[PDB]
Design a protein around this ligand. Structure first.
Ligand code: HEM
Ligand SMILES: O[C@H]1CCCC[C@@H]1CNc1cc(Br)cc2[nH]ncc12
Length: 369
């Protein structure tokens, strides 16, 4: 629906995002569009510091506002991390922080790049008459020449969109349970499983478009945040807007609404327990667009799909429920392999692994089998 801002084609992603801002913001667009060149040449922080505080009043519709969040969030990452070898900035100039925070509070997101910026809104179709394929798609922004940002962000999105195809089946699952349509429920659960099975196959493209050295040594620097970060132990002064510095976490697929919503749908209690894994995924919901955050708590309001299947003594239903759980297990298992190639191996030339393995365990132990 439109009350939750879920598109029938791309789900939680922003459909056909805006590429251009009103000419009044050209001084933003130029820095954002040339971050690689400007960083390399020691001129990024300069060009930022020479900016005039612009007003967000000319950002009239949602898409224009989302684009500027992406522009300003990428500038902020560039400004704070600089060249990504340690010369850090801990105060962000008012000429940029003030419009950023005002545009942020209006869209109900923290003033920091989030998944919904750099994946869900950081894309375009090359030719609009051709479909959503990697070859028909590009990102809007990058940080460095060679950072594989187009590969990482686009493959992330294409997996999102693949998994997104199961979202339209959630209403039928809940109506089938309510009106006791056993065979309809079963068909719906297998269609959802089928969708999470394609999402895995899409994920395979990551290897052609991302390389480990670039992800580990470049891209991950610019996706990092300032929450529990020793390089900014107290957070980031948003000059002109907040007195004391604030801590906000970096971009994460933990901020994706598709995967969190299938854990909810299936009663995989990712956000229960009180433990570190659950608390993290709960926190990451505040880094989501408000309608998407609301979608998820609305799913939790609904009768448990798991408890209904469990109580029914129906092997066919249980195999279908498990076909969905299994697909998440498979997805998460593949992801652990990818995390070995792109983080763990390069780093030899963690709390990460324990977090992912706890989420994957909770998923596997949800199987009925
Ligand atoms: C080079 C590729 C990738 C790397 C190195 C990577 C790495 C990581 C790491 C280290 C985490 C845990 C830390 C954190 O949350 O910040 C994580 C979480 C997560 N990643 Fe990735 N990721 C990659 C691509 C993807 C893709 C393509 C997807 C999904 C389509 C994905 C889905 C997730 C999800 C859903 C989580 C949250 C926990 C979970 O639900 O299992 N990642 N990723
Ligand atoms: O683990 C973190 C280490 C440093 C900060 C960024 C790294 C993970 N962030 C991600 C961002 C986006 Br966008 C998408 C993602 N999918 N999976 C992980 C991830």
């Amino acid at each position: 629906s439109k009350e939750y801002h879920i598109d029938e084609e791309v789900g939680f992603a922003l459909p056909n995002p805006q590429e251009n801002l009103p000419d009044f913001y050209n001084d933003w667009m130029f820095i954002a569009k040339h971050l690689p060149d400007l960083i390399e040449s020691g001129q990024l922080r300069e060009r930022v510091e020479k900016l005039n505080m612009l007003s967000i009043d000319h950002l009239t519709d949602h898409k224009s506002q989302r684009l500027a969040r992406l522009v300003l969030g990428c500038i902020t990452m560039a400004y704070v991390w600089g060249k990504g070898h340690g010369d850090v900035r801990k105060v962000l100039p008012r000429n940029i922080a003030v419009p950023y925070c005002q545009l942020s509070k209006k869209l109900e997101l923290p003033p920091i790049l989030v998944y919904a910026d750099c994946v869900l809104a950081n894309w375009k179709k090359k030719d609009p008459n051709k479909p959503l394929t990697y070859e028909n798609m590009d990102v809007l922004f990058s940080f460095r020449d060679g950072d594989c940002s187009k590969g990482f962000f686009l493959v992330s999105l294409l997996v999102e969109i693949a998994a997104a195809s199961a979202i339209k089946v959630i209403p039928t699952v809940f109506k089938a349970m309510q009106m006791q349509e056993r065979d309809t429920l079963l068909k719906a659960l297998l269609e959802i499983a089928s969708c999470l099975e394609k999402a895995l196959q899409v994920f395979h493209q990551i290897h052609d478009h991302v390389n480990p050295k670039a992800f580990f040594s470049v891209l991950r620097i610019y996706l990092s945040g300032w929450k529990g970060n020793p390089q900014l132990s107290d957070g980031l002064v948003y000059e002109g807007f907040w007195e004391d510095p604030k801590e906000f976490a970096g971009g994460s697929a933990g901020q994706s609404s598709v995967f969190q919503c299938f854990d909810v749908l299936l009663g995989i209690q990712q956000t229960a327990g009180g433990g570190h894994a659950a608390q993290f995924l709960q926190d990451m919901r505040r880094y989501m667009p408000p309608a998407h955050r609301n979608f998820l708590c609305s799913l939790e309001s609904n009768p448990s799909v798991r408890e209904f299947v469990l109580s029914k003594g129906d092997a066919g239903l249980r195999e279908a429920y498990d076909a969905c759980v299994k697909a998440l297990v498979s997805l998460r298992s593949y992801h652990l392999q990818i995390v070995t190639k792109y983080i763990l191996i390069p780093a030899s030339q963690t709390d990460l692994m324990n977090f992912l393995k706890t989420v994957r365990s909770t998923t596997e132990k949800s199987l009925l089998k």
